[PDB]
Design a protein around this ligand. Sequence first.
Ligand SMILES: [Zn+2]
Ligand SMILES: [Zn+2]
Ligand SMILES: [Zn+2]
Ligand SMILES: [Zn+2]
Ligand SMILES: [Zn+2]
Ligand SMILES: [Zn+2]
Ligand SMILES: [Zn+2]
Ligand SMILES: [Zn+2]
Lengths: 284, 288
Amino acid sequence: FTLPNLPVNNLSHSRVMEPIAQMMSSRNFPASVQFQNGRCTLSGDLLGTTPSSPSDLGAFVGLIAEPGSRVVELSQPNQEDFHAGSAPAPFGFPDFSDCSLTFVVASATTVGERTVNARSPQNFTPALGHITFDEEAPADLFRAHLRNLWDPTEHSFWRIPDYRADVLGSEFAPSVSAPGVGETLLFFMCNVPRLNGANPNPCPCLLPQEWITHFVSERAALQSDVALLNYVNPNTGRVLFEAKLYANGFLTVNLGASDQATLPVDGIFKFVSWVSFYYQLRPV
Amino acid sequence: GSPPFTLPNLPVNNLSHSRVMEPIAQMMSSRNFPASVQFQNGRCTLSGDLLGTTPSSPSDLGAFVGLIAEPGSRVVELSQPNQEDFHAGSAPAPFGFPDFSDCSLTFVVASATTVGERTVNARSPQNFTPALGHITFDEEAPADLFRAHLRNLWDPTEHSFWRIPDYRADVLGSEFAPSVSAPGVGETLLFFMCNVPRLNGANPNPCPCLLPQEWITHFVSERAALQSDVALLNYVNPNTGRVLFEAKLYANGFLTVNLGASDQATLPVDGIFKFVSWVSFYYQLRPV
Ligand SMILES: [Zn+2]
Ligand SMILES: [Zn+2]
Ligand SMILES: [Zn+2]
Ligand SMILES: [Zn+2]
Ligand SMILES: [Zn+2]
Ligand SMILES: [Zn+2]
Ligand SMILES: [Zn+2]
Ligand SMILES: [Zn+2]
């Protein structure tokens, strides 16, 4: 079993297309999260809306329902049809809430911005295969990229929106929490552009995109439920701290007596050995 | 101690473009494509040596970090996309900076206080000077430090994605990624394609690149030793295991195919490239 031999500050975020800027763990972070993007088992099984093609992250493909409408019918980001009820949303669709989403929108004839209100039950219904922009949709087939958040809150990057679908369905990526005693989830962080509202940043994710991609490529056999990792200084080889990588695709650390930790991103995670659920991590 | 050479086990339609942050949509080769190209992004040796402006962080592709030179100015001083200083002459441009020409480049720009659009005229010798460590927007720069990512091209041409711009620097300099052409007789370069947003002018699409981003990333991680200058590859149907065609993967980071009697080919992207064997420059490819 292996990880890519790359420093964290060369890795990319997995819920938005941005480089990973920070690494954080905290007892004041939510104990459980249910991100739909950036979700993959160590054996390379993608979960939720995690796109098979990484560049589809935060993107979608839409077509106006009828001339002059604000309503767009959703496809998969590879222009293949989106089957309603098959998933919370088309693959790569943003899993943010408590805000409006402003997308850059590009068709054969136009480039501009459109905004969808994720607070609106009427407009935000991706599981049904269509959403309603705040403005009139472009006349033709377009590709959209998430550009910024409008009027977000502190909860925007931590709580998934109402997809107009039951979150306990098998099509959803399941909730994640640190199972080990005293353990807390390790999050990869970046900042996302936003206008008005309150500061949503930082944006957390469980896994780097490169790790997810690697897992899918390797399809490694797991000899245990938990992989032990050392965070190592690439120049000296010295260990800064150890973490456990659980089979369902997340990292935890032992904060020990501490309630918080902001970790340097110039190190490299290395696979040490296979350990068990009960392995007790040395405090950060 | 160097590991053997390997490729990621992923179909092409799950791979990402390496000159713009887009999924690879098509795979094409043609005798009517330019015989040589000198892309500065998406350049990497099989042993994991990055070339040109190819960013160590993939998310920096088509991005840059800038600061306005003085209050009210259109001129922005360029940094590296991780804010380390950009020393002029070290490279054609800061890492990840777009290598497109014959157009204007419209970026989405985000600072602590603003999100908007800024445009640089790449046809302008005075305004497009990234090698000197600054460029001049069409509009007044944001008041504070910003990050920009490529949004669309304005008024491009058919050559926009094929010819690199004038960085205001000697393109034969050692800091440039060298020109690339199919070395074998009758061979043509295999290009990975996607579409890029554009307004007005003439259609520049599709946008070519030599290597998938994931391959480049994989090469950097592995730092593999090569047993020869050329790796033979089979493009295989992952479901059935059958070979669709074979291609040559050269050490300096590009693929070629034999189109045979054909002058053009658009190839399916649902297959997977598999490492076959080590061959030489003179290996003769079975026609696609
Ligand atoms: Zn279908
Ligand atoms: Zn519908
Ligand atoms: Zn796009
Ligand atoms: Zn400590
Ligand atoms: Zn410096
Ligand atoms: Zn604007
Ligand atoms: Zn011409
Ligand atoms: Zn890999």
